[PDB]
Write a structure and sequence with these properties.
binds 1,2-diacyl-SN-glycero-3-phosphocholine; homodimer
């Protein structure tokens, strides 16, 4: 009863803080002040909060549909997180995010420099996750930290379902890692450390391939430990396509900045590998992840035989939104990896990144359902 | 325990909290030293006190339900659809959200064409319309029951006195200040203001109006004595309530004889202060001995208490006793100050500070009155 009350409290403190944020942005902002670094820094936090909210909705749908998402994840049958707790955590982090944004927008609050407010938020999140005091969701935080350890260094780690799931979720949430690297550079060699104005009126390729690299080496490991080349080397190639696409984007940008003559051939390679990568991940999503387009569909054409969710319109809406937002994700991870689009730049990424988490939230239902009804991942 | 009701209660509580923080941070920053905000607090105090009373009554319902004091057979309520404390929290949060929105609109004046004197009127109109909403929605049963109870309270001599009307008439004593503010509104919209300006403010009969709760309490226990012929509790109860009449009349006469020179102000001051002492002592001893039932014989381990308590800690009872003794004098001094013109130097500060404290004192008193009506028939009902 108190958890539901806290969910309601946070959902509404966050609402009024959002209204205040909109009013301050349309009123308090001093016209030309180069807001872009601020929104780029806070985009990671906003994406994390949205991902937590969408994952709460995911747990809600999983519980209603009758799936054993506490068994596939190998979670304990008791003392796991329901949708209420995820909503509460999301609301608390959103409250902190809004308070930090309002403090940044309101300089006359104190004489303390504004640029400390972002870290005080993000560091808090780390301090929230690094909580050895066994106070707040200690089992959940311990499980998450163990998963992060077994994911971020996972050549020498047998891959269970949770490892693969978080590794896949990293690709769609990689905007946070990109923004982290950008803010590290911004604090290193952009701001002056003297003026109290945080607005300030090829590594990128590696960092963006990092989630792809983790899932690549995790599927290579799965093949090594299983000997089934088809279900795993295919995914290895799927993320190799991401490697090639990011590499060709970087080469194209470098050669265009240098005025290199042969940059058009690099553009052609980039576009062909973009088509290849997008189609590859899309066909894997539809055919293997969700398990749709099964030849034994019958009356459930374009879907599979066994359907758990009530309405079939959800599946078709998801198919269309997937075939659109997967192209969106590929174009976004190609643009933000380099200086591909100087004009749009952060605008298209800021529009698409929130949608990549939505696409992954939608994909979570069907991946969990496909793995539940028939053990698609071979995790047994 | 419905999840959606608790979510809405938390939502309204959070909105109310953030709006109160914004009000505190705005009245300090977005106000002007040339303004006179007193006719604004003197208007919104009724709504704020009503919202606080609803919140405290939700807490009281929580306490009664978790303590075993079934306020469904000793409150004349149907034991099939009873307003839970969560619903009281929800209503209080909704009214508080409306209160904060109207207050913020008055502070900022978002619309230029709308002058800053309709927002309090809009808030109070919305509250009364919610109370008198003809259609069957938004706790229609509870609102109809409350309307009928208010009807039979304000016409107490013509109705048999049950417990519900007795209790509502008791609660009106500490809500009497609200009516006083209403009277001020009646003057403020008829004597002050220019009906076209948009600002706070440019740089009696209410003495009789701080009697209607006391009047209804005095007429009750006399309508009861008419049918029961039990003078022992009822006549002294009526005398206790008439101490209020004497105190208010003498405060008014002292104010009238002090505002102009008549050479007998000291006599009125002496008689008013002795009436103050006797009324405060009368009410205090009635609450401690008759209403709460404390200081009863066979105390045993529970010294100064009854032989059978309900609440887990006797520390609660002792704090209640001390709180009543140090707030029943504040209640009387607030009655003296508001009903007349005693201290123009401070004036409204004392009333606006003591009124929420008096509502809190009622909140405490409700815990033990129903307890002593369940472990007894205190009030002589059954
Ligand atoms: C290196 C840079 C950062 C990279 C990582 C960024 C954070 C990624 C974390 C997101 C995923 C968390 C939820 C996934 C699993 C939940 C699914 C589920 O149902 O599982 C139930 C689990 C727990 O289930 P449980 O509670 O029933 O436990 C199971 C029982 N045992 C343990 C006994 C088996 O849910 C969780 O683990 C969620 C709780 C944590 C949610 C996030 C809180 C902290 C948020 C801040 C993270 C750090 C931000 C850093 C930003 C930058 C800083 C510089
Ligand atoms: C009047 C509403 C007008 C439309 C508003 C639209 C606003 C935008 C869309 C919001 C959609 C909300 C969907 C929530 C999930 C469905 C509700 C649900 O689970 O109810 C059951 C639960 C109750 O659980 P329950 O007990 O019903 O559990 C189900 C079990 N059975 C079926 C057996 C009863 O409702 C709740 O009280 C919890 C969820 C309510 C919504 C919580 C929102 C929290 C937000 C915190 C901040 C988020 C920050 C990031 C947000 C994104 C960026 C802005
Ligand atoms: C950290 C606390 C102190 C700082 C915050 C101050 C908050 C206000 C002062 C304390 C409130 C008293 C305790 C909470 C209310 C009692 C109910 C409770 O705890 O029961 C547990 C209940 C659940 O109890 P339950 O019915 O499940 O019973 C538990 C026992 N079983 C399950 C076995 C039957 O939790 C809630 O859902 C509480 C929700 C309400 C919380 C209070 C805030 C409401 C605000 C509404 C607006 C008020 C407007 C007026 C403003 C103030 C006056 C000017
Ligand atoms: C001049 C204005 C005078 C105003 C005087 C004060 C008015 C407000 C009174 C509040 C107390 C009422 C609740 C008592 C509840 C105690 C018993 C209990 O717990 O039972 C639950 C009770 C009974 O609810 P129930 O649902 O159990 O109903 C009983 C069931 N039946 C009917 C089948 C028998 O709950 C209520 O009575 C709640 C009523 C709804 C909340 C109303 C809030 C106030 C609305 C505005 C008031 C007017 C504002 C001023 C207008 C001025 C205009 C100029």
């Amino acid at each position: 009863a108190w958890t539901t009350f806290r969910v309601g409290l946070f959902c509404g403190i966050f609402i009024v803080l959002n209204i205040t944020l909109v009013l301050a942005a349309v009123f308090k902002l001093e016209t030309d002040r180069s807001i872009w670094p601020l929104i780029r820094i806070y985009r990671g936090g906003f994406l994390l909060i949205e991902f937590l909210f969408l994952l709460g909705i995911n747990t809600y749908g999983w519980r209603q549909a009758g799936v054993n998402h506490v068994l596939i994840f190998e979670l304990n049958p008791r003392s796991n997180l329901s949708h209420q707790h995820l909503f509460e955590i999301a609301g608390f982090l959103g409250i902190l995010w809004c308070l930090s944004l309002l403090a940044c927008f309101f300089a006359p609050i104190s004489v303390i420099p504004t640029y400390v407010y972002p870290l005080a938020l993000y560091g808090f999140m780390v301090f929230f996750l690094i909580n050895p005091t066994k106070t707040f969701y200690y089992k959940s935080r311990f499980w998450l930290l163990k998963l992060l350890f077994r994911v971020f260094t996972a050549p020498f780690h047998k891959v269970g379902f949770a490892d693969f799931w978080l590794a896949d979720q990293l690709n769609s949430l990689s905007v946070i890692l990109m923004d982290l690297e950008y803010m590290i550079c911004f604090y290193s060699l952009e701001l002056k450390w003297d003026e109290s104005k945080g607005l300030l009126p090829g590594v990128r390729a590696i960092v963006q391939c990092i989630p792809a690299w983790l899932r690549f080496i995790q599927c290579l490991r799965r093949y090594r430990d299983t000997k089934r080349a088809f279900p795993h080397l295919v995914n290895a190639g799927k993320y190799s396509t991401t490697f090639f696409m990011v590499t060709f984007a970087a080469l194209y940008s470098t050669h265009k900045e240098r005025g290199h003559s042969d940059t058009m051939v690099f553009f052609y390679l980039w576009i062909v590998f973009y088509i290849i990568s997008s189609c590859y991940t899309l066909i894997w999503d539809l055919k293997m992840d969700w398990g749709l387009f099964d030849k034994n569909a019958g009356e459930n054409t374009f879907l599979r035989e066994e359907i758990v969710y009530p309405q079939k319109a959800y599946y078709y809406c998801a198919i269309i939104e997937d075939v659109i937002l997967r192209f969106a994700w590929t174009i976004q991870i190609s643009i933000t990896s380099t200086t591909l689009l100087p004009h749009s730049g952060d605008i298209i990424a800021t529009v698409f990144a929130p949608l990549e988490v939505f696409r992954r939230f939608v994909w979570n239902f069907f991946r969990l359902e496909n793995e539940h009804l028939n053990n698609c991942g071979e995790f047994r």
